Amino acid sequence: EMHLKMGRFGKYMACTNEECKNTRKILRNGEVAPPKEDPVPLPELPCEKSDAYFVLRDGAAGVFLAANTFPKSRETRAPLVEELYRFRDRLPEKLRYLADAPQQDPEGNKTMVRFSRKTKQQYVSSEKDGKATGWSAFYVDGKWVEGKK
Amino acid sequence: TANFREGLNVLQYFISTHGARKGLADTALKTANSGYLTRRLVDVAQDLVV
Amino acid sequence: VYSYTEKKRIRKDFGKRPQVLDVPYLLSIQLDSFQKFIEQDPEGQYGLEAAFRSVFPIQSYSGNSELQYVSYRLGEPVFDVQECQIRGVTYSAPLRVKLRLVIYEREAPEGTVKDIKEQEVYMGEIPLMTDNGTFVINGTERVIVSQLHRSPGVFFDSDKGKTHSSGKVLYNARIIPYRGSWLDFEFDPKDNLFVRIDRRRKLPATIILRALNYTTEQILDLFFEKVIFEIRDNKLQMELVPERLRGETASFDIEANGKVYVEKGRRITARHIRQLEKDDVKLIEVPVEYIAGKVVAKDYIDESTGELICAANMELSLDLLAKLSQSGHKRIETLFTNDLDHGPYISETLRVDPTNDRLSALVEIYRMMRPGEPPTREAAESLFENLFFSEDRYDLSAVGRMKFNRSLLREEIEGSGILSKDDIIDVMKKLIDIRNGKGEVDDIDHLGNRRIRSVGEMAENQFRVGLVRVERAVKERLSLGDLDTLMPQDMINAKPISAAVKEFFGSSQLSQFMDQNNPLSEITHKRRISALGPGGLTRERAGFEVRDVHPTHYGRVCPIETPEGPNIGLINSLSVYAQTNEYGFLETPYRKVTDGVVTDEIHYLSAIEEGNYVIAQANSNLDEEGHFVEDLVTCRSKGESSLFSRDQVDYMDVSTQQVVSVGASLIPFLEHDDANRALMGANMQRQAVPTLRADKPLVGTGMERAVAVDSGVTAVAKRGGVVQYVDASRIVIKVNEDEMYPGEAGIDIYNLTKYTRSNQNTCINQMPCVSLGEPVERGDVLADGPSTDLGELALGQNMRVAFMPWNGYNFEDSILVSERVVQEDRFTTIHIQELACVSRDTKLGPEEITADIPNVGEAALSKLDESGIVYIGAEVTGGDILVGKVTPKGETQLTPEEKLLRAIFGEKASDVKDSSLRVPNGVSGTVIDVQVFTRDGVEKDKRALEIEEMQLKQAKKDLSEELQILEAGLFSRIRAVLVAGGVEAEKLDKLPRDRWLELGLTDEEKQNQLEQLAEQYDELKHEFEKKLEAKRRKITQGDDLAPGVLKIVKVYLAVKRRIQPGDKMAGRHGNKGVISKINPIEDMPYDENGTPVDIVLNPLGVPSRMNIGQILETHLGMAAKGIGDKINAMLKQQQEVAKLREFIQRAYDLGADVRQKVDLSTFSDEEVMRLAENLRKGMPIATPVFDGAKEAEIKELLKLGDLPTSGQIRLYDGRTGEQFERPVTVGYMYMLKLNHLVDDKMHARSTGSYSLVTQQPLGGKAQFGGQRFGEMEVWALEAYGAAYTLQEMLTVKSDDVNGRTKMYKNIVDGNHQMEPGMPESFNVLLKEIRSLGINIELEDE
Amino acid sequence: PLDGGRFATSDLNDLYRRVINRNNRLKRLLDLAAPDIIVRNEKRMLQEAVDALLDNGRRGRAITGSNKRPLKSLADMIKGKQGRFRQNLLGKRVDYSGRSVITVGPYLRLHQCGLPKKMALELFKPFIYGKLELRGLATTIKAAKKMVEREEAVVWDILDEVIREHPVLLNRAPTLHRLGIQAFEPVLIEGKAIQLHPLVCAAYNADFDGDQMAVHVPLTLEAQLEARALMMSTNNILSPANGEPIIVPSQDV
Amino acid sequence: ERDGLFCARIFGPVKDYECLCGKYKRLKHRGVICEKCGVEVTQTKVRRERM
DNA sequence: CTCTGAATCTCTTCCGACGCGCCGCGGGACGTACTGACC
RNA sequence: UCCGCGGCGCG
DNA sequence: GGTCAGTACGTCCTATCGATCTTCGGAAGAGATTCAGAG
Ligand SMILES: [Mg+2]
Ligand SMILES: [Zn+2]
């Protein structure tokens, strides 16, 4: 069981088990934050605007890549599906499904992992010339279903 | 007992330093006290004109 | 016997007291502290090892996993000190810590391990200390000042009755832990004892006693003594201790064993007590009225009924006495209270106590600590246990425990770091004792109660804070991690430790930008002691008592060198011989006096230790086997000096200069000048600017060598030998055979610092003071630094001074300077400025460094190269472009008609605005260095590539030259070894050096030495290769510039600044002045020989200022010059070495009972000639601080030089040739240039920028701001009738926008008329008042 | 705007942001028919936020920014030594002002002071521009500025013309009494140090051990005449405190 | 921002006599309140006065 | 023996000289998705 | 360009 | 309907009060409590 507590940072949720110190947080328009996963560093992905390396993070916004010196570099970008497939092993048990998503659209363009806030779920969408190609694949019941947006 | 043409001992110089530093610190505080008094006097008397 | 280096120029000493203890290394207080911080400690008592053992091992919450610490290691820094200074990074070493993660089996026992892993976790960077006690934090060089803070322990103090009417002395006790909450006890005017924690709401003291599980009966038993009563038939008896009757009025008859003797109304006299004791009166009979009114000690319960007849602390009364008698209480116990010796304070406090149980007391303290919330038994118990009784949150340090036990007279000096119940009880008992009249309050300013906390301690504290944060994170991750699929590196985040350490070294109040005017500034900054800082005092709240000189400062803290202003007394200077005890207390050395003989044995005593003994003054005379010549010797003992017999003396001072600091010690004739002027002179020595050419002080104190050497400004030879190569930048020494290690090249290379910028924009330059082939010993000065001359501190210049008024140009401390001083560049100084041009990314385009600056003539562009950066060596003046930079103007859209108009006007139709770096107005200098820093990913310009290629060539050349020198040394070793055995000298010369290395040898250990040196040669080659590759990659690599910065171009300007009127000059005796006129040479006063004076000083300053030491120096300096003159002429006449030797020997022997004893008969003729050439300008003289030259000795030295004894000569006015009517004191004084230069002070403004909100002129010269016309100036104008001037200063010249525009236009038009309006600051005030909900308006507008 | 794309913000902006956040949250809770406890807590927080905005620190602990220093409220803007009244209204920074280290002019008459030529040029720039355009040497103001920047000889002649009988005010801090500001006719001197008449030093309490003095230029005719008639050193030979002479011989004199 | 603490249509234009959207940018449009963004064309000094 | 007023005690708030110079450090900003209005 | 803090110095 | 601009929400990141810097002196005013006099 996990209960609500208040402290210097407002209101949070902490688990009653003395052996477990897991803590979630209250957000603006929800009962409680989703179960944010542990950050996973990737030394093989280099930053472009700086010399840092990218680290995968999770949150209500979604799953993203951020510089390891985040207060200084402050460089973030969304991961590609091929990038995830390159480092599939390091991904925690939950996120592995993202690696199974199709990596390229029928037009052969490269895909990117996005977060649909209206449905609170991760999908993969393809972009060409920086604009969305209008093709997206979602995860519905253990399979990936793809179609025009 | 000694003057300044003669040399003060180490002990005599150490004794004199008490008065020296006391005077310096007293000036440091006295400036602030006098300034506050002067500002109060100016504020009370600034209206008066012949 | 004097060394070869010392024989160059021997300063004649005038001291008479033999030196027993050499002056300690002046920077030990910093180096020792940091060494304790970083160096390994197998016992785990100091530094990083102690912190690691304090935090580790780390375990999970009831888990089967543990993280433990094995060892730590400081790695090699990535950059050296110079590289860090150039690149603007911290000189730090990485901290590698070996850690072991152990996971046990789930089955019992808990100790059954099942897997162990070990790895070297990296946990941040530790800023290392340089060889001279400094830190490089962001390229900037910083000093961590030591802190004089209240020692942990317990202190008893009084308010001296100031807080209450009639001056009732209220007593308080305070427990100061090293880390934790404070605990104070204090007496109220009603004699009630109260307690407070962290100076929070006052509470009754007994509450704490009740919180420690002590009942009221137990409290009374602890604090009071009991009196026993018995009731038998109709008789009441008391058990009496006769001493208890002392001071009590005999209000009733006293009978015992059928004997009665009492005088009613009288006090019980001592004779009465003695009679009672001898009669063995153990019991007395007393009336009911006497026992009525006493306080019940323990609760009494009627056994028949179980009803509490009388509780503890209740006052006895006749009815209560009858009740207890009828109940059957044969024996009664009360508590004894005497109004003089045994007060009722605890009982009265219990009466005022609003609690009645342990839980009630815990609830009360919980509500006091955490107000506004309901209490809880578990929460209250946890809070009380954590406040003082948990090692995690309370730490009364080892020094704290020592002081705590000493104050309570406990035998043990070691113990637990948390408070026990007995500790609190004993503190309360001691406070009650002080209230009663036994014991005295502590002296807070006593140096035995203050403690020195240095760099290592503070760094350890911050590291411990970071490490406890890391420990909390580690516990969390260990409890909530995948135990087997990770490594120790995955559990430790280095961010908190690095953050804490970096914050301490950058933002702390004690981490200070090092003052670097001269070497004395560096030494005095590193020896500084501050009462401020974290855990210390504050300027506005520290009283006079803290600032004042205390008797315990003798030999520990200088009484003179404290600064003026708000910091007076709060910033002190460590004395010359003072060091720090193990516990952090200042110690001073003394010579042990054993059976009337002073011994060379030296004991370092602290203030508490010093108070016990009788210590003789350093000037007390003793001869042959040490014995006080005088039967009576002056001593100070317990802060009260007087005369004592020889036998009573326990210790003697080690030196006559052990009371002063370094700066005060450098002042000659300090005992002849007032402490105020001595303070001013010591402070002003630190502001002296190095000059173009260093000049030794003719009149010194003998401390110049120590200051110059201990400060790392000089290149000091670390091994003796013969100098093999010299130039302006490099000294190469061939080490002696008996001084080099086996398998070594035997060559030392010293690289000199040439024209680098100081923290104060002054010049740091090292110059060789040795020549080819000259012998060098260990410790010899090889190169002089700023303000150093042959290894002696040279802050200023020796100047010919006449003390006379001269036509008002010396009117008020003003100084008249000859033009010969300016022509000889004696006070000319070099200033280096760093100017930076920063290219930044901006909206609508990045800024570009280019020479194509719009709307700028080709003449201004000619000084630049093709990349837009000024050439090295270019002479530049104010307004010239150093680095050309442009910035996009924005869109600035123009209509086609507007575009045509701009095209017709000229080149104004451009989208680019000038943002180039220009020389500040008034600055004229030369470009001596250009450094280009480029963010990685930005293409390097042509100038950047050229600089990179030059740096690569320089690196290759330097490494190759060092390798060649080391190889030459190694092959010299080869030749020496082969000569020592198996010599083939002719064949060896025929053979090349590689064949020499390939040659064999006889079967001796020399073959082993050859093998070792060949291996060292291979190591030299490999080291050269790896260093070349590393330096190449470091030069090529990009720079970690600030975000948004594309490239930074830094230009260094060297300006030689000549002495001009307005510049501030001072001597060493508090004699400040500002130059008023540079007088032509023919106008200066001159003597019979025609020599003009260089500086004319006003005689009037000396009498009022009482700095007579400057007069004596002026005399002695004259003598110092006179001897030199007699040498100089003797050198010009090319006289024989014999006459020169005789005269110089006479000069050295002139003193009376001097301890120097120079003997020129042991010097070679060439050495004597070298000495005489060095003595040609003057004979340097050492006059120690309180053992200096007497007046008669100065007269004798003047007589040797054929100079007048009075020190006054007949001067003639150069303007008229007429003799001045009286003889004038003309001599030589050492004068300084005090960095308060007029060209840094002059500023003028007509119109410039204005503040955004106040719409008033900016402030400061750097901002080109206007002067502040404050309220006192407004009062001055109001005292006059200056209404229009005041209006124009308030309205037009400051804040009225339309007014100032119209005034400018009218002045241009020739109309000096004002059109004043409303100041904008008043509109701001109206809006701010309206923003507060107050309707403020102007009426009848 | 700052270097690096950051924006320097006033503390008032933070206070207003807190107030607006609390107000909007309270309005949203009121719309959604929130329970009494939640709306009461939100109202209390809004009251605390408004109190902090008006006068921070008067009740409870003052709300602090990221620097752990209390935020500056409107009362702090009005109150104190650094407030508007004492820092901006009763005293001001002024144009046409300068400062420099003072030295002795023993050749000076009582009514004149030595003024550095560079300081005079900078201070009298607008007068020089006007006299340049009067004589036709500079057609426009830009030409006048270029001429003065180049420091031509005719500019020096113009500067000598403009300072002939134009008094300047010399002030030494602290201005304890009205003699702390006095008017002098400036004589242009080479060098960067102001030359002060020896007899006025006692009134200024000025010595020459490093003192700096401030120079102000009266602009208007009334200001010049007040300097000449009321504030000039020749009118200040008696002390207003006691009537005894204040311009009294000392030291070498 | 549209209704923030520095709003142009509440307190005034950022630059003199220029609308926020740039539709009107000269003194000839003085006093005109833009239909697109509601910012009056006037001097920036009003941002110093308007509460 | 009790009640009221005056006096005394406790707690909280306000004030503390002016002018000038130098150095160091810090200070919310950026990204992505969804909704509305206009064409 | 603004504000704040810390440290140091001069009058 | 489709596209662009504007607006909304999330991330950095928390979770014990524990970080945190922490502790003057003097004078005046307001409120609370106690003593003396009168009933
Ligand atoms: Mg002075
Ligand atoms: Zn618009």
Q: How far apart are CA D215 and CA D160, in angstroms?
A: 17
Q: What Å value separates CA C571 and C1' G9?
A: 14
Architecture in CATH of C828-938+1039-1057: Beta Barrel (2.40)
Phi, psi of C97, rounded to the nearest 5 degrees: -125, 120
Residues lining strand G at under 7 Å (Cβ) are C 145, 509, 512-513, 515, 530, 532-533, 563-565, 567, 571, 683-684, 687, 1072, 1236, 1249, 1251-1253, 1258, 1263; D 1-3, 8, 10-11, 67, 69, 72, 82, 172-174, 207, 209-212
As a whole number of Å, the CA-based R_g of chain B is 20
Is A13 within 7 A of strand H by CB distance?
A: no
Q: List the single residue in C569, C653, C674 with the smallest CB-CB distance to B21.
A: C569
C162: nearest nucleotide, CA–C1' criterion: H25
- What residue of C is the nearest CA neighbor of A38? C481
Q: Which are the contacts of C986, defined by CB distance < 8 A and separation ≥ 6?
A: none
Query: Domain C656-712+788-827+1058-1241 class?
Result: mainly beta
Method: cryo-EM
> Which of A18, A21, A51 is the closest to C480 by Cβ?
A21
Question: Can you name the residues that pair with C592 across neighbouring β-strands?
Answer: C651
Distance of CA C181 to the CA centre of its chain: 28
Instruction: Give residue numbers, 101 to 160 of D, with CB < 7 Å from strand F.
Output: none
Give the DSSP letter string of C845-874.
S--EE-S--TT--HHHHTTB-TTSBBPTT-
Set of chain C residues whose Cβ sits within 8 Å of the Cβ of B18: 548-549
Q: What are phi and psi of C30, to 5 degrees?
A: -90, -50
- Residue C134: exposed, middle, or buried by beta-carbon count in 10 A (0-12, 13-18, 19+)? buried
Measured from the Cβ of residue C1064, the count of other Cβ atoms closer than 10 Å reads: 24
E19 known member of a binding site: yes
Hey, is the C-beta of D176 within 8 angstroms of any chain C C-beta? Answer: yes
Residue with tokens 């009942």: C215
Confirm if C358 and C213 have CB atoms less than 8 A apart. Answer: yes
Token pair of C518 as six digits: 């001269």
Neighbours of C511 (CB within 10 A): 20
Flag whether residue D13 sits within 8 Å of chain E, measured between CB atoms.
yes
* CATH number of C152-224+343-443, picked from 1.10.10.60, 1.10.8.50, 3.40.50.720, 3.90.1110.10: 3.90.1110.10
Which token pair is C494? 């280095």
User: Which chains contact D through at least 3 pairs of Cβ atoms less than 8 Å apart?
Assistant: C, E
Interatomic separation, CA of residue C842 and C1' of nucleotide H8, rounded (Å):
27
The residues with which C239 forms a beta bridge, in sequence order, are C228, C283
Residue closest to C807 by CA, chosen among C1073, C1076, C1072, C1066: C1076
CATH topology of domain C575-655: Rna Polymerase Beta Subunit; Chain: C, domain 4 (2.30.150)
Sign of CA dihedral C618, C620, C621, C627: negative
Q: List the 475-514 stretch of C: residues with Cβ below 8 A of A.
A: 476, 479-480
Cβ–Cβ contact D17 with E under 8 A: yes
**What is the spatial distance, in angstroms and rounded to an integer, between the CA atom of D39 and the C1' atom of F31?**
33
Q: Among D124, D129, D219, whose Cβ lies nearest the Cβ of C1303?
A: D219
- Domain spans of chain C, in order of start: 25-151+444-574, 152-224+343-443, 225-342, 575-655, 656-712+788-827+1058-1241, 713-787, 828-938+1039-1057, 939-1038, 1256-1341
Helix (H) or strand (E) holding C748: strand C747-751
Contact C449, C586 (CB under 8 A): no
Distance from CA of D32 to the nearest CA of E (A): 23
Burial class of residue C34 (count of CB atoms within 10 Å of its CB; 0-12, 13-18, 19+): buried
**Which of C566, C578, C624 lies closest to C604 in space, CA to CA?**
C578
Nucleotides of F under 7 A from a protein CB: 9-11, 13, 15-35
Q: Which of residues 89-128 of A touch strand F (CB under 7 A)?
A: 114-119
Nearest-angstrom CA–CA distance, C444 and C150 = 8
Nucleotide nearest to C1043 (CA to C1'): F29
Do C1299 and D197 contact (CB within 8 A), yes or no? no
- C810 and D CB contact within 8 Å: yes
Beta-sheet strands, E only, within C1017-1091: 1045-1057, 1064-1066, 1072-1079
Kindly state the DSSP code that residue C96 receives in the 8-state scheme.
E
Cβ contact (<8 Å) for C1331 and E49? no
**Which chain C residue is nearest to residue D250, measuring alpha carbons?**
C811
* C1271 backbone dihedrals φ, ψ, rounded to 5°: -70, -30
Chains B and E touch (3+ CB pairs under 8 A): no
Rounded to whole angstroms, the Cα distance separating D100 from C302 reads 93
Question: Strands of C58-59's sheet, edge to edge?
Answer: C58-59, C65-74, C92-104, C113-127
Q: Are C102 and C112 in contact (CB under 8 A)?
A: no
User: Is any Cβ of chain C less than 8 angstroms from the Cβ of B25?
Assistant: yes
Residues 4-43 of B with CB under 7 A from strand F: 28, 31-32, 34-36, 39
Nearest to B4 among C568, C653, C1108 (CB): C1108
> Do residues C103 and C111 make contact, with C-beta atoms less than 8 angstroms apart?
no
Asked if E touches C (at least 3 Cβ pairs < 8 angstroms), the answer reads: yes
Is D84 in Cβ contact with C1272 (below 8 Å)? Answer: no
Q: In chain B, what is the straight-line distance between the N-terminal and C-terminal CA atoms, in Å? A: 58
Among all residues of chain A, which has the CA nearest to that of C1041? A50
How many Å lie between the centroid of ligand 2 and the Cα of residue E49?
A: 21
Does residue D68 sit at the C interface (CB-CB below 8 Å)?
Answer: no
SS3 content of chain D, % helix, strand, coil (to 5): 45, 15, 40
| Edge-to-edge strand list for the sheet holding C450-453 | C450-453, C146-150, C528-530, C571-573
Interchain contact E51–C (C-beta under 8 A): yes
CA-to-CA separations, C566 to C524, C532, C547, C947, in angstroms, rounded:
19, 12, 10, 48
The DSSP output letter for D107 is T
Angle at C757 between CA C927 and CA C1050, to 5 degrees: 50
Q: Tell me which residue has tokens 């990685």.
A: C936
Per DSSP, helices labelled H in C527-576 are 544-547
Which contacts qualify for B6-10: CB closer than 8 Å, 24 or more apart? B6/C672, B7/C669, B7/C671, B7/C672, B7/C1186, B7/C1188, B8/C671, B8/C672, B9/C617, B9/C619, B9/C634, B9/C671, B9/C1186, B10/C617, B10/C618, B10/C619, B10/C653, B10/C656, B10/C659, B10/C1186
Tokens of C367: 């509500």
Q: Which two tokens stand for residue C709?
A: 């050497």
Measured between CB atoms, does D136 come within 8 Å of chain C?
no
| Topology (CATH) of C939-1038 | Helix Hairpins (6.10.140)
Strand pairing partners for A128?
A: A131
- Distance from the Cα of residue C139 to its chain's centroid: 20
Specify the nucleotide whose C1' lies closest to residue A10 (CA): H15
Q: What is the DSSP-derived secondary structure letter of residue C700?
A: E
Q: Which residues pair with C528 in a beta bridge?
A: C573
Q: Strand C615-616 and strand C651-653: pairing?
A: parallel
Q: Does A93 touch chain C (CB under 8 A)?
A: no
Strand order through the sheet with C135-136: C135-136, C141-144, C511-513
Task: Work out how many CB contacts closer than 8 A connect B with C.
Answer: 84
Q: C1027, C863, C838: which is closest to C935 by C-alpha?
A: C838
CA of C593, C1' of H5: distance in angstroms: 93
φ, ψ dihedrals at C291, nearest 5°: -70, -25
Whole-number distance in Å between C648 CA and H14 C1': 68
Binding site for Mg(2+): which residues of D?
207, 209, 211
Which member of C808, C1244, C1309 has the closest CB to residue D119? C1244
How far is ligand 1, taken at its centre, from the CA of residue D143, in Å? 43
Q: At residue C698, what is the residue type?
A: L
Q: How far apart are CA C1295 and CA C900, in angstroms?
A: 38
**Beta-carbon count within 10 A of A117 CB:** 10
Q: How far apart (Å, rounded) are the C-alpha atoms in residues C364 and C200?
A: 13
- Distance (Å, rounded) from C-alpha C490 to C-alpha C485? 10
In angstroms, what is the span from residue C1073 Cα to ligand 1's centroid? Answer: 9
The answer to whether E7 is a known ligand-binding residue is no
C562, C679 Cβ separation under 8 angstroms: yes
Q: Is the separation of the CB atoms in C1206 and C686 below 8 Å?
A: no
Cβ proximity of C559 and C659 under 8 Å: yes
- The CB-side HSE value for C1040 (13 A sphere, CA atoms) comes to 12
Contact with chain E for residue D16, Cβ under 8 A:
yes
Task: Judge contact between C1067 and C697, C-beta under 8 A.
Answer: no
Are C571 and C530 in contact by the 8 Å Cβ rule? The answer is yes
Q: E5 vs chain D: nearest CA distance in angstroms?
A: 8
C204 DSSP β-pair partners = C194
Do C656-712+788-827+1058-1241 and C828-938+1039-1057 agree at the fold level?
no
Cβ–Cβ gap C1246/D95 under 8 Å: yes
Strands C815-818 and C1072-1079, how do they pair? parallel
**Residue C221, helix vs strand vs coil:** helix
| Cα of E39 from ligand 2 centre, angstroms | 6
Answer yes or no: is E37 a known binding residue.
Answer: yes
CA dist A96 to A84, A105, C687, Å?
9, 20, 68
Write the class of the CATH domain C713-787: mainly beta
Question: Residue C102: phi, psi to the nearest 5?
Answer: -120, 125
H/E stretch holding C1026 = helix C1005-1036
- For residue C1209, the cross-strand partners are C1224
Please give the Cα distance from C766 to C808 (Å, whole number): 41
